[PDB]
Amino acid sequence: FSITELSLPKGGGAITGMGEALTPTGPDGMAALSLPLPISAGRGYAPAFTLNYNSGAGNSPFGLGWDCNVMTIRRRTHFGVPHYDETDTFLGPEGEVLVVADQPRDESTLQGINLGATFTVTGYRSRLESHFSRLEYWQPKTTGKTDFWLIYSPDGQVHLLGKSPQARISNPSQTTQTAQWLLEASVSSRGEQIYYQYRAEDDTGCEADEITHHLQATAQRYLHIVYYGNRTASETLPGLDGSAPSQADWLFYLVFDYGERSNNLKTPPAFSTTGSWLCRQDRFSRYEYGFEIRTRRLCRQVLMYHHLQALDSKITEHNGPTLVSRLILNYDESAIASTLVFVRRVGHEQDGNVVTLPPLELAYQDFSPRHHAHWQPMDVLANFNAIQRWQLVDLKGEGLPGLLYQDKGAWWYRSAQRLGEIGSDAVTWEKMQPLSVIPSLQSNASLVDINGDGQLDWVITGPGLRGYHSQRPDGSWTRFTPLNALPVEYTHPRAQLADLMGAGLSDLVLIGPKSVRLYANTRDGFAKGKDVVQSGDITLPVPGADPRKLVAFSDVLGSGQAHLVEVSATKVTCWPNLGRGRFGQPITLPGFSQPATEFNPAQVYLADLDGSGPTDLIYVHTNRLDIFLNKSGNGFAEPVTLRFPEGLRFDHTCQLQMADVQGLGVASLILSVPHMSPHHWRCDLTNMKPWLLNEMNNNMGVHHTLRYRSSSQFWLDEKAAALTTGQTPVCYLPFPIHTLWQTETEDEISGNKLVTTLRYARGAWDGREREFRGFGYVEQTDSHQLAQGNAPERTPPALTKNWYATGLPVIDNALSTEYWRDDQAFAGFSPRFTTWQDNKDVPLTPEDDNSRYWFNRALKGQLLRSELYGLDDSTNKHVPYTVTEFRSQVRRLQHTDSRYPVLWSSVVESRNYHYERIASDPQCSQNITLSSDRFGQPLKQLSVQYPRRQQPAINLYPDTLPDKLLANSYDDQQRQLRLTYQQSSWHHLTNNTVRVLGLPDSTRSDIFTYGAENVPAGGLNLELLSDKNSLIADDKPREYLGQQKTAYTDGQNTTPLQTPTRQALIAFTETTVFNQSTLSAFNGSIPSDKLSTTLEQAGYQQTNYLFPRTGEDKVWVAHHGYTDYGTAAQFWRPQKQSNTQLTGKITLIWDANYCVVVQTRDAAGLTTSAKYDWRFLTPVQLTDINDNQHLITLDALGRPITLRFWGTENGKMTGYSSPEKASFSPPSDVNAAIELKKPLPVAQCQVYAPESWMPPRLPPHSLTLTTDRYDHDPEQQIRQQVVFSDGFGRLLQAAARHEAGMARQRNEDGSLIINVQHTENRWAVTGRTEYDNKGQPIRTYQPYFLNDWRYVSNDSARQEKEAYADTHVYDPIGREIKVITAKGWFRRTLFTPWFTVNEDENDTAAEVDPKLYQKTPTVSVYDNRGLIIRNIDFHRTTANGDPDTRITRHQYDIHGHLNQSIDPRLYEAKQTNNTIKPNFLWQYDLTGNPLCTESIDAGRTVTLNDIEGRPLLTVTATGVIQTRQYETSSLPGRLLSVAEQTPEEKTSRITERLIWAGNTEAEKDHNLAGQCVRHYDTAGVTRLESLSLTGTVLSQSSQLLIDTQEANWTGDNETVWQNMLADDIYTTLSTFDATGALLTQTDAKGNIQRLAYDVAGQLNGSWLTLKGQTEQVIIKSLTYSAAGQKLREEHGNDVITEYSYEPETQRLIGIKTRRPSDTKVLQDLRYEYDPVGNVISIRNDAEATRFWHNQKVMPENTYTYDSLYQLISATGREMANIGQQSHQFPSPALPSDNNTYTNYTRTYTYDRGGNLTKIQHSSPATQNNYTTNITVSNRSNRAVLSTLTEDPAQVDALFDAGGHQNTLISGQNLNWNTRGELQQVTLVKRDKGANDDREWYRYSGDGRRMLKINEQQASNNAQTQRVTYLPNLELRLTQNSTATTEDLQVITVGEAGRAQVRVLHWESGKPEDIDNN
Ligand SMILES: [Hg+2]
Ligand SMILES: [Hg+2]
Ligand SMILES: [Hg+2]
Ligand SMILES: [Hg+2]
Ligand SMILES: [Hg+2]
Ligand SMILES: [Hg+2]
Ligand SMILES: [Hg+2]
Ligand SMILES: [Hg+2]
Ligand SMILES: [Hg+2]
């Protein structure tokens, strides 16, 4: 919940690109990318699309790999073509099998619409639930209508799929056969709609060939236009009645263009077009639904249009809807495959110009057979003597072919195996093994089973088998063919296949990995010389019947079926496989040909060579071969002819095999020669898989390279690794899988690289469902490769080991064997199987193999275990930083269907260990879902924080730790077992026409806290915690944390609903703040019998406990976050909002279309208005509460480019000129804009240059120009800033234009030049940072001056030592563990699980007397909740002293709140007295707001806040009751008054009153609307009269109370208050520049100060005009360092001050003040610091002033510290007669006194609690030796000068209850006011009736001193000195009973302590010798 606030967006900053992202690799191993599309959110409900790349995906309307899909329901095609009857299975939008969920019912209407038929409606649900959406299949029972689907989403959306023909994919020959129902319409619960309009495939733009060969090419559908932002709210699906969309009814249109519209950069594509979409070169067909679906189109542009005329009637649209955004998709077009290579975002301006982002480029692995072909002998087969009668086939499905051969007279197989070392790709074949089958007893053809040992997967043919009847042996021998190279229905032929196979096949001969040549047995058609058979309407060839034609199965179409193919001398012909034995009409694939006398089918091979994967045709000649590449199934490319190795000739005695020996998914060439040696040769045409995305470049300096590796190779690696161990690997992946192996990111700006490397094992293939389950092991290594020049210390590679469930028990059960071993870790997790019964999980052991199969399958994909390591040189390198593990539960929801149950898989337990590489001492936490409801919402959850382990016997911590640190890291807070128990309830709205799940109802938290002995071995788990003996059983005591309830409204009724409506409108939220026990904090502060009423008035209410337990009565809650909602017709938009019942509503006024808020009216009637740019729906013009205007403009990409503001000040129009009075177009080039000069009528302008890294080359950058005065001010300056970003959008540096001066240089090649020179083009460069590819700032640079705004190269910065860099080192967690400063000192941080060790620059100094600080780190010690329970320091005053361990302890209660803190000193005292109180005790409400504080230093403070979080009642340490009143409940709730009452007072006093302005014309004229304009306070009244356009104070005034009047603003009559005031009105008036910086300030006496600024906005001049006088200069000139620090200051007295900085740190080391007139250095302070920055010496190099007789040299001051940086000693000079220090002030030495100065040494002593207890002053030469003692309380830090007491037990009585000292020194009482401010010091107490000498004080309401009065009452003389403190002015008035003897005004110019100048002006009583002013 939040209050709507209108504001304008800001310009400039970091440059972003298109937001494309690499998607983290899962156990699927694929490369994936996502690319956002420019889609307007519109009103909120909008279609959602992203363009996605997956390396495993085929062709699509976006080319290979890329796709962008719409939600669909479809028939399953995985196991074969559907039958288009009730035996079919359906898939949901996520690909999950749908299962019938309830009984079919009759329905005639939907959403009030008459459907024109009776429908049978069947509910379905996903087989594996995730979201619990509900699906319905609507099928007509009566005539004239068609089926459709609905989806009821769990968030209340309803979706309509495939109702109208435009949104269906159907068989064009049989329109009843529907394959896919596409999303057609959606509607949300709040009345928003979306309609999806598709375009059907057609013949437009195609050639005659394409049109002729593909009949009924109208099946395919392409999303075309999405209509959204309905103009009229409706709860009905749009188009449900069957009507087509009307564009007038909508505000937004998303359009996918397929080539119809113009595609240049000088005209916007028009919404309406007569254009023809393009016909792509790679047209392709798919057949898995049983009929041809032809794709001819590619999406070229994604276009966003707005109905501007409807969004803003001031805009007229003659041109149709207006283009607001545009994405261009450019392809590398090819007849083989098109690929997306170029993606660009473009915006069009009204003047015809365009503005663009840099394009995203993508490149793909090419296939170049000519370049890569070279034959290698296969030496590995040197002893393998088979030539012709062997096969290279993958028998077992290992993903690489093995050697299958007979050696008389037995059969043998040799599996592939790794050759040489793991990680290489070289292959050999292992020792021969016998085949489990015997070929000779198998019948010809017929399935067989071989070793080892897949179910029926191969077919065997051969002359010796029974059934063999061929006429052409030999060559015929026993051969093997994989079953999956044959049609699905090979085992049960019918139709065309059956006619083709006639009386069976004789021989099946592989001519490719998946291509089979066929020969028929002698025929049964009783025609044996017939070479064709008629099969219905097609004529099939009889295979083998014509010996001059090749007949084969092969996928020449790349669609995933085994098609029929005939190759003859003249043509290639394909009959496509339509499923169910059916084959389609013949398609010719030209142009392969060969002379008829030469053609020989024996020389033809069919194999996918490029991985497209239509199969390519290889024709073998005797000395060469012709490669005919397959053009997307449409024919063959011109032949590429490659030579055989010299000088071999291929003939009928040889063998050539096309086989995938690389596991690349492409065929290589394997040649066996009978005479030659060696006998076997191979040629690979490629080593990488073609067509995979391998390069990206965003053209902003980020380059990605992707490398892949076949999973077959990971298989070989795993198998070889398993050799050394004893295990035996499970094969997987018959089908080859190409895994993403490496991702290399290159930052072209920094030159830094990052290489992420993946390694896979335990791949799992499920033979039953025929799916790849994933890899059970994924290992990722991140290695930085930093550019040359960077520091040696770097992040070392991080290794993450991950194990994932595959759902195959044989794998999963063995995973935990590889887990990092810890003998004290808790027991590992096992999956939990349950069945859902009577609304609960009942655990079960799965009944049979089937049930076991499905329950296990549901586990797949879940991360089981993750370990993170750092691969450095540490002794702990093998111990993880962290370990996580997870437990899955699978719940059976239904199993009526005999095929499969419905299951819901989820994570029920997780465990997280933090070891930080200390094996013996981790933290561990665990989350458990105890129970959840039927839709998976948690009902009971538990979080467990485990206690630290008992101290181990063997110390694994580093021996560099300070002595005893480890022992002192133990604390009782580490030793509690903590169980946070959360209960939750939910509303679910469900019936046939409604579904909204998981609306929160209520939650409650409690916590159980137990001693460590309650932790079982080994660990808690769901079962132990659900048992009746449980630590969390209902009868166990627990502590209440709180509760919350969400209240719902129907939108009209004020009474909350019992059950929400579908709109789920939240009326308010109810949160508990107090229970009985927390209220104990107010005992003795608020009377018991007045408590309820008080809490009630504060806004709290009583309610019952939720999930109430025995004995629980009431809690106190706050209701907050109220909304009043509009009607259904207003889309239920919020019309009013308020935080609580205590404050008023804000009114929200929407545009006519309810898209945006155009006006807010707050509870005091103050109005803010916004005009919008309707191209982007962003505010561009704001009218504020004072009617001032703020205006920005946007470019065509929606980026702010100008800002202006104007309006009245003091009733007169001022500010920048409107665009009407002064036009301004901002420049397009940074250089032109930098040349611009005054006047500019804008406050700001931006120029964007995101393309600057594209060619002279700069990182992406933006320029901001800012004026500092309004355009009619002739003194307007133009500030200039350029900000550079890298390719990841991270800030590299900022450059600001400075005044001319000395700077370093950038030369033309971008190199930094250290030598300084004068320049007129000077810039200060700040924030200069080098990052690594993770965004870690690894180098930071000191600010510097440069003679250019342009970027200095990174390499140049790394080279120059004088660039002053700090280097930062990070661990694999991203934590910084070391910083080496530019000076070479360093900081270091050690992270361990229970404590963090910080070492600073002094601590580590000795490694780089510094021995003093050695081993004195600061340590933070943690409990098991991440809370800091100890701070440990090490105290030492001498290098050889033994360190004192100083432990400060913090205790957090079971609510997690800071309960106590105690310092080392009091803890030590408490060791022999446990009643001693800690420094602080705190009590809180249930939400953690402090209610009470008991401080031994400051006493007890108690506070009650109201439900708005505002202080209502406070009781101070001294018993004062302070109460605050605020505005009533229809106002914003601002402070109106402050009242206080002392325990002695009977009635309260009103000490403050605030009066707030409304918004009358006079108040807007002064910009006062809503402001506090009169504040009566403790000293008088302040009045605000005038504010500037920038919110600065133009005029304000003060009046003080008269001296005899105390603040008490009683009554409602302001006149009596005014009557309490002194007459003097002190008015301060100012003027400011357009940036709000002060220009002039006139004080209460009319003296004017004037300031002036340089071009960077730094003060560079200062003047004063005393009243009645002429202006005089105060600061003549002032220059700055690049870090903005004072450099050279020249005052009006001509004196010059020069500040010197240490270049590496910016530390101030010199302050030199000199007088030019006589060239005299007056003061020259030189500072020296230790490495951390303590001042260790100060020298004054000037000679002594003339006040000191015969002395010239001033001694160096030396300072020494203890290890806690307390000042231990100091030396310096003091005047010789100074005497012993007191509160008194010395008389000044005068020139004629001839005084001298001497040396002193002070030594300081501190206790163990920070108290300074002794000052020893040694000044030997002058006998000025003494000791100041301070006595510290034994129970607190109150401490006093020993003259007040020497007894620690008597110190506290010298203070009031709030710790304010009551006596300054003896004889001098201190009085404090009721706000704890010093009210009076009595300087001399006198016996009655005489008068005291005293000084007293008055303060403003915010604690600023306004008045000081000093009364001397000596006779004589009685003197009163009065000091009034005003802005820049002191009035110092001295009076006596008879006269005024001095009237002094002190003018102050500048800041006190920063070279402030004071001017003394007397009105009377000026001393004679001093000139006035
Ligand atoms: Hg799409
Ligand atoms: Hg040969
Ligand atoms: Hg041959
Ligand atoms: Hg070759
Ligand atoms: Hg296998
Ligand atoms: Hg543990
Ligand atoms: Hg208290
Ligand atoms: Hg500008
Ligand atoms: Hg005020």
Side-chain angles (χ1 to χ4, degrees), residues 373-375 642-643 669 683 685:
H374 184 27
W375 295 87
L642 267 33
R643 292 179 59 193
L669 305 127
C683 178
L685 295 181

Side-chain angles (χ1 to χ4, degrees), residues 1452-1466:
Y1452 299 78
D1453 58 32
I1454 64 203
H1455 298 246
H1457 304 146
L1458 182 62
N1459 177 251
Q1460 321 185 356
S1461 292
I1462 184 168
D1463 78 42
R1465 192 192 150 234
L1466 302 184

Side-chain angles (χ1 to χ4, degrees), residues 1358-1651:
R1358 281 187 301 261
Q1359 289 336 104
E1360 267 303 332
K1361 184 176 182 48
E1362 286 160 317
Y1364 310 129
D1366 283 24
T1367 53
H1368 307 259
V1369 190
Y1370 302 79
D1371 67 13
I1373 303 272
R1375 293 170 309 197
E1376 176 177 82
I1377 62 182
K1378 190 177 189 171
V1379 175
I1380 304 179
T1381 63
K1383 246 191 150 186
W1385 303 116
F1386 72 96
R1387 300 193 297 277
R1388 198 157 58 196
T1389 308
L1390 171 67
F1391 294 98
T1392 83
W1394 302 92
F1395 62 90
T1396 296
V1397 182
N1398 300 290
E1399 301 176 270
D1400 66 26
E1401 293 87 349
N1402 278 22
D1403 295 324
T1404 64
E1407 295 185 28
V1408 37
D1409 282 340
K1411 211 172 170 60
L1412 171 60
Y1413 306 106
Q1414 202 171 34
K1415 289 190 172 179
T1416 73
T1418 303
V1419 182
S1420 298
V1421 178
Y1422 296 87
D1423 64 359
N1424 56 354
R1425 294 175 286 190
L1427 302 166
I1428 302 183
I1429 61 181
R1430 300 165 173 221
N1431 183 76
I1432 305 184
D1433 273 303
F1434 299 81
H1435 169 272
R1436 190 190 269 148
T1437 58
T1438 61
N1440 296 292
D1442 208 276
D1444 164 30
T1445 304
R1446 304 266 180 99
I1447 305 182
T1448 294
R1449 285 164 173 85
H1450 307 288
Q1451 177 84 28
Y1452 299 78
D1453 58 32
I1454 64 203
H1455 298 246
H1457 304 146
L1458 182 62
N1459 177 251
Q1460 321 185 356
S1461 292
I1462 184 168
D1463 78 42
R1465 192 192 150 234
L1466 302 184
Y1467 179 85
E1468 174 71 9
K1470 185 179 176 97
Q1471 295 282 74
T1472 56
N1473 184 345
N1474 61 34
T1475 69
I1476 281 172
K1477 291 285 182 43
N1479 301 68
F1480 293 87
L1481 281 157
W1482 291 278
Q1483 297 187 258
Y1484 303 83
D1485 63 27
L1486 297 171
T1487 59
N1489 293 310
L1491 301 184
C1492 144
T1493 303
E1494 300 180 353
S1495 167
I1496 50 171
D1497 287 338
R1500 191 202 289 182
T1501 301
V1502 170
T1503 297
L1504 172 67
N1505 293 339
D1506 61 24
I1507 64 181
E1508 291 266 340
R1510 305 172 307 191
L1512 168 54
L1513 195 175
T1514 295
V1515 185
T1516 73
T1518 57
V1520 180
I1521 300 163
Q1522 308 172 320
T1523 54
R1524 301 182 166 242
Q1525 309 237 9
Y1526 304 88
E1527 287 172 313
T1528 51
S1529 59
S1530 66
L1531 289 168
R1534 294 155 310 179
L1535 181 66
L1536 286 186
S1537 73
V1538 176
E1540 68 174 47
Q1541 185 178 353
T1542 70
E1544 307 79 41
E1545 276 173 325
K1546 195 47 190 170
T1547 171
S1548 79
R1549 223 162 60 260
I1550 310 299
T1551 55
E1552 304 186 45
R1553 295 254 192 210
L1554 288 72
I1555 296 149
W1556 299 84
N1559 62 351
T1560 67
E1561 192 190 356
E1563 296 163 309
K1564 292 177 169 184
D1565 277 345
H1566 291 81
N1567 308 313
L1568 291 184
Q1571 300 282 347
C1572 184
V1573 295
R1574 296 197 294 291
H1575 186 174
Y1576 289 83
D1577 66 11
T1578 43
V1581 67
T1582 300
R1583 269 186 287 267
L1584 171 65
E1585 294 114 11
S1586 188
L1587 288 176
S1588 77
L1589 291 183
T1590 56
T1592 56
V1593 181
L1594 296 177
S1595 182
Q1596 71 180 333
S1597 68
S1598 292
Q1599 269 177 276
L1600 297 177
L1601 283 162
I1602 54 172
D1603 293 345
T1604 55
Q1605 200 75 42
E1606 204 56 30
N1608 190 4
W1609 317 110
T1610 53
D1612 74 281
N1613 188 4
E1614 182 161 358
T1615 290
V1616 347
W1617 308 342
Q1618 291 174 339
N1619 293 340
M1620 288 150 167
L1621 306 169
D1623 288 318
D1624 279 273
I1625 293 174
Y1626 309 113
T1627 301
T1628 298
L1629 52 105
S1630 314
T1631 60
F1632 301 83
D1633 71 16
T1635 77
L1638 183 68
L1639 289 181
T1640 73
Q1641 190 176 318
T1642 312
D1643 68 28
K1645 289 297 180 165
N1647 312 297
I1648 310 172
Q1649 304 185 11
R1650 188 179 122 245
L1651 308 180

Side-chain angles (χ1 to χ4, degrees), residues 584-691:
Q585 288 292 331
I587 322 180
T588 299
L589 312 198
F592 166 81
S593 65
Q594 220 71 262
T597 63
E598 296 171 44
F599 182 70
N600 175 9
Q603 291 161 38
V604 180
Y605 295 76
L606 294 171
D608 187 21
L609 296 177
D610 61 10
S612 285
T615 47
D616 306 298
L617 190 154
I618 301 87
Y619 192 93
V620 179
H621 300 283
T622 72
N623 70 331
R624 69 197 188 270
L625 39 88
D626 298 338
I627 298 173
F628 290 89
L629 297 188
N630 188 312
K631 306 191 296 173
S632 187
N634 302 304
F636 301 96
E638 297 298 307
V640 175
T641 298
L642 267 33
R643 292 179 59 193
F644 270 121
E646 169 133 13
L648 302 184
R649 52 162 211 63
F650 192 81
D651 60 79
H652 80 269
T653 68
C654 316
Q655 190 193 14
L656 176 66
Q657 287 183 86
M658 310 297 302
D660 193 357
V661 294
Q662 300 184 89
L664 214 47
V666 299
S668 290
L669 305 127
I670 307 292
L671 165 75
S672 305
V673 182
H675 291 335
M676 185 82 179
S677 290
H679 292 286
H680 308 288
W681 290 76
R682 79 186 257 179
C683 178
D684 310 288
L685 295 181
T686 178
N687 298 137
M688 291 175 286
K689 189 179 198 172
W691 304 110

Side-chain angles (χ1 to χ4, degrees), residues 39 141 158 182 199 218 341 381 419 639 860 976 1028 1227 1275 1319 1333 1448 1537 1741 1749 1763 1838:
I39 299 170
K141 304 167 78 157
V158 190
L182 314 172
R199 188 171 166 173
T218 59
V341 289
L381 302 183
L419 177 68
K860 71 187 191 313
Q976 312 318 302
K1028 72 185 54 179
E1275 284 175 10
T1319 180
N1333 294 1
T1448 294
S1537 73
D1741 280 340
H1749 188 80
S1763 65
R1838 277 75 171 278

Side-chain angles (χ1 to χ4, degrees), residues 1224 1240 1242 1244-1245 1265-1266:
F1224 174 76
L1240 298 185
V1242 305
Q1244 281 188 358
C1245 256
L1265 302 175
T1266 305

